């Protein structure tokens, strides 16, 4: 393992310090690592790049309608007297 460790060939690369001193470091040495080694360079791959099937679209639409109905029902569930008083008090404190 000590022999076949990563970056172990660096001990044999530099045969002498003369070549290492003659080799001038360029600014491209910093940017040559900003590219993938095997595949192509891509800008971004997020959750918004996951295509939806027909059943997935139907499920998402049903979930959104259920969320809408749940919000509409929570607006009436939280319509208690003290809860409405707290809500309007917080709204007044926010607007003022």
């Amino acid at each position: 393992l000590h022999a076949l460790r990563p970056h172990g060939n660096w001990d044999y690369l530099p045969l002498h310090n003369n070549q290492e001193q003659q080799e001038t470091a360029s600014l491209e040495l910093q940017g040559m690592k900003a590219s993938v080694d095997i595949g192509p360079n891509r800008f971004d791959l997020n959750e918004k790049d996951l295509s939806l099937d027909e059943e997935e679209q139907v499920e998402k639409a049903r979930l959104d309608n259920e969320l809408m109905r749940w919000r509409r029902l929570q607006r009436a569930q939280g319509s208690d007297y003290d809860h409405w008083m707290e809500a309007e008090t917080r709204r007044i404190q926010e607007m003022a």
């Binding site: 660096w10 470091a25 600014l27 940017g31 360079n41």
Partner: protein, 301 residues
């Protein structure tokens, strides 16, 4: 008796050799524009050659190789650099686990410590200790701010007259007293008197204000397309500048970041539209200059 140069404000840019070497070492590699996963900043000595504990921890957490970064840093920074000199390494790691690092000169605190020969824990703020630290002038601060620009592609921008305000604020936060400020008098001149020095300061101040105004107008009128998209602008654009912006490779990433709705470009555009609406709603006449409206507000509370 020997003077280097007698000219009304001409010692602004550093030496040609050091500016060339700084353009060599502190450079801006072409950024790809990919999604940024991490932004890290570390302080690494250029004289030593080893894998730092914190950068190694970061690269191990991300699954990357610290030996490659150490090798490139020790091959680019070990020559033409003093012994035991700190440098600010800013690494940008993208979602492809590809990292691009830039090197930057030491911070203002490091510069002040080196200039004042004070070591660690030898300075403290006044509200914490109760006494000022070693006295300073606002000329070593100028020479320090000379070596800390925003981009080494244009060392003249930003202006030293603006960099010195930030560096003197940092020195005051550190707890250092000055001669020009926090003291009614500066260092006295032996060959000259007080009234002559005062009138000379007045004339030098007005001519330096003229120079600052003309240089600010020049730099604000002539700016690349990247600066036009990232910073406010009210001047026409030249065909040569359009061609240079087209030659620039980062134009795509700059345009996309500017088109992003929460960009500083959109912020400034919304601010300008809001100022237009403000003038249209609280203006005496149609052609109300914003400066005239500010004078109106100042005179009418």
């Amino acid at each position: 008796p020997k003077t280097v140069c007698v000219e009304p404000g001409s010692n602004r840019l550093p030496e040609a050799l050091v500016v060339e070497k700084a353009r060599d070492i502190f450079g801006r590699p072409e950024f790809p524009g990919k999604r940024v996963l991490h932004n890290w900043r570390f302080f690494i000595k250029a004289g030593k050659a080893a894998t730092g504990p914190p950068v190694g921890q970061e690269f191990s957490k991300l699954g990357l190789k610290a030996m490659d970064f150490a090798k490139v840093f020790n091959d680019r920074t070990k020559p033409h650099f003093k012994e035991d000199v700190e440098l600010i390494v800013r690494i940008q790691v993208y979602f492809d686990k590809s990292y691009l690092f830039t090197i930057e000169p030491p911070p203002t605190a490091w510069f002040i410590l080196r200039a004042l020969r004070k070591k660690r824990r030898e300075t403290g703020p006044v509200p914490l200790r109760g006494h000022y630290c070693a006295l300073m002038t606002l000329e070593m601060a100028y020479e320090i701010a000379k070596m800390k620009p925003l981009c080494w592609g244009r060392p003249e921008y930003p202006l030293l007259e603006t960099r010195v305000r930030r560096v003197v604020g940092q020195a005051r936060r550190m707890g250092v007293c000055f001669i020009g400020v926090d003291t009614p008098y500066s260092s006295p001149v032996k060959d000259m008197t007080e009234q002559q020095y005062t009138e000379e300061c007045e004339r030098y101040r007005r001519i330096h204000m003229e120079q600052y105004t003309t240089l600010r107008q020049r730099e604000l009128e002539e700016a690349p397309l990247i600066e036009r998209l990232h910073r406010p602008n009210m001047s026409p654009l030249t065909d040569e500048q359009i061609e240079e912006g087209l030659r620039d490779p980062c134009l795509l990433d700059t345009l996309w970041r500017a088109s992003h709705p929460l960009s500083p470009y959109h912020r400034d555009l919304r601010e300008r539209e809001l100022a237009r609406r403000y003038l249209n709603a609280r203006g005496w006449v149609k052609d109300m200059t914003p400066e005239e409206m500010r004078i109106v507000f100042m005179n009418y509370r």
